[PDB]
């Protein structure tokens, strides 16, 4: 808008929010800071009219704190505290996921068109700083294939498994309910069979004629699920260590489907394990 102050007119800022404000909580508090509190709905793109119009407009949303580089830490098996501290602070890069339907939108396969125009941000100063907010110093976007987005989603899922295994590995007096959370959600891609979706969508030769040159990515999926499988194994083992009477039925379903997918990757996917 135009009615903004000089430093505010058609500007973009990122706010080091509180620990646990939900998006619209902080949003409303900001609205308290301001009159003419009309909120936009095309959250990603701007408005050229409002790039000149008066009657101040705003749009706010959460963004991703890009991981810092832990200096001299790039390989050490450092405990969690170091990680979690650098997951929050001394940050300057901030990406925002961008859903998009790119191509043909078949009903059963939402992964057919997921193309993420990942919008990142660079600001002047590193959070936290002498202001709980700063303007973006430079914006950038991306483009992410269903192959790619698949890749990152699954690998981050796997490392989340690893993290929960480790946090309940150092500590014993710790609720197994998160273990149920994960092991359940992963054990059945029930709503959509993710693994089967990847097989039909990319492992199929319709895709390796769709992406012959970009077949070197379905092999990425293969090696990544291959690295996933043993991680699933430690998940299963720790579950057995924390197995309870409600859990034995759950555990056996996990185990059965788990070696099922073990053979599925080894021979049905044909991948090689470790």
């Amino acid at each position: 808008g135009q009615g903004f102050p000089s430093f505010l007119r058609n500007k973009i800022f990122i706010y080091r929010g509180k620990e646990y404000e939900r998006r619209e909580d902080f949003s409303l508090r900001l609205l308290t800071q301001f009159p003419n509190a009309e909120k936009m709905t095309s959250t990603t793109p701007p408005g050229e009219d409002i790039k000149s119009s008066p009657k101040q407009y705003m749009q706010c949303f959460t963004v991703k704190p890009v991981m810092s580089l832990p200096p001299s830490y790039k390989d050490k098996p450092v405990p969690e505290q170091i990680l979690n501290y650098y997951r929050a602070n001394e940050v300057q890069q901030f990406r925002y996921s961008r859903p998009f339907r790119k191509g043909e939108k078949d009903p059963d396969n939402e992964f057919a068109t997921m193309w993420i125009e990942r919008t990142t941000y660079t600001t002047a100063y590193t959070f936290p700083g002498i202001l709980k907010w700063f303007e973006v110093k430079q914006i950038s976007t991306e483009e992410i294939s269903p192959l790619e987005n698949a890749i990152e989603t699954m690998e981050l899922t796997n490392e989340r498994i690893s993290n929960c295994v480790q946090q309940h590995a150092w500590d014993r007096s710790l609720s197994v309910h998160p273990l149920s959370m994960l092991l359940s959600g992963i054990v059945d891609p029930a709503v959509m069979g993710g693994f089967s979706n990847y097989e039909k969508a990319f492992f199929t030769e319709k895709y390796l004629q769709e992406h012959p040159e970009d077949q070197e990515k379905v092999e990425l999926l293969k090696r990544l699920i291959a690295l996933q499988m043993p991680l699933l194994t430690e998940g299963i083992r720790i579950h057995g260590e924390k197995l309870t009477e409600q859990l034995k039925p759950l555990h056996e379903r996990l185990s059965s489907c788990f070696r099922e997918l073990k053979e599925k990757v080894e021979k049905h996917y044909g991948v090689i394990t470790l």
Binding site: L28, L31, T32, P35, A37
Partner: protein, 198 residues
């Protein structure tokens, strides 16, 4: 007093906007309003602050505060000023229509006001007494930007207009205003003022 009244009621609006401005001041300073059937340990009193921006309503189940309004985040600091359909008064309040556990007795017939929003959510609230009930109805109707439904509001209107016109009549002492306004002496068609302008 014929042209006197013509002039007096004809110069209405300044007092009108003055009273409305005072009403907005009142809603902003606000107080702890009243809930429904807050008997078995319920905070019957709870502040309801209009923003100085006059757009958000800092209201919600605040404690049995004798001090009244406390400036902080109420339970729901927002009531959308724009979308309020109206406020129902008396029997039109569905909570007045309630005949169960939240049956409001006939002694709060004039204290019943339900502010309409979302078309399925209501604000079944109670005033401490009638005069401020009418005051807050006036305030929301000033948010509605319409006529005022407080007896006290017409009282203040008429009385302050009376004093204002009464102090107006000071320069015109020992004079009569012809009910037909005095004939405008003819302006010569030339505006070539012999003596200079300003």
């Amino acid at each position: 007093s014929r042209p006197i009244l013509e002039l007096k009621e004809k110069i209405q609006p300044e007092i009108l906007e003055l009273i409305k401005q005072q009403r907005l001041n009142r809603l902003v300073e606000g107080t702890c309003f009243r809930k429904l059937n807050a008997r078995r340990r319920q905070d019957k009193f709870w502040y309801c602050r209009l923003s100085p921006n006059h757009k958000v309503l800092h209201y919600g189940d605040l404690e049995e505060s004798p001090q009244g309004e406390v400036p902080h985040d109420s339970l729901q600091d927002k009531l959308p000023v724009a979308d309020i359909k109206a406020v129902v008064t008396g029997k039109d309040c569905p909570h007045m229509k309630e005949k169960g556990a939240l049956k409001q007795n006939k002694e709060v017939l004039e204290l019943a006001f339900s502010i309409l929003y979302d078309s399925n959510c209501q604000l079944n609230f109670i005033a401490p007494d009638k005069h401020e009930y009418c005051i807050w109805t006036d305030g929301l109707n000033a948010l509605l930007g319409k006529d005022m439904m407080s007896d006290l509001t017409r009282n203040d209107l008429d009385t302050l207009l009376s004093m204002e016109i009464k102090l107006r009549l000071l320069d015109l002492e020992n004079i009569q205003i012809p009910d037909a306004p005095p004939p405008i002496p003819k302006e010569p068609s030339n505006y070539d003022f012999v003596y200079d302008c300003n």
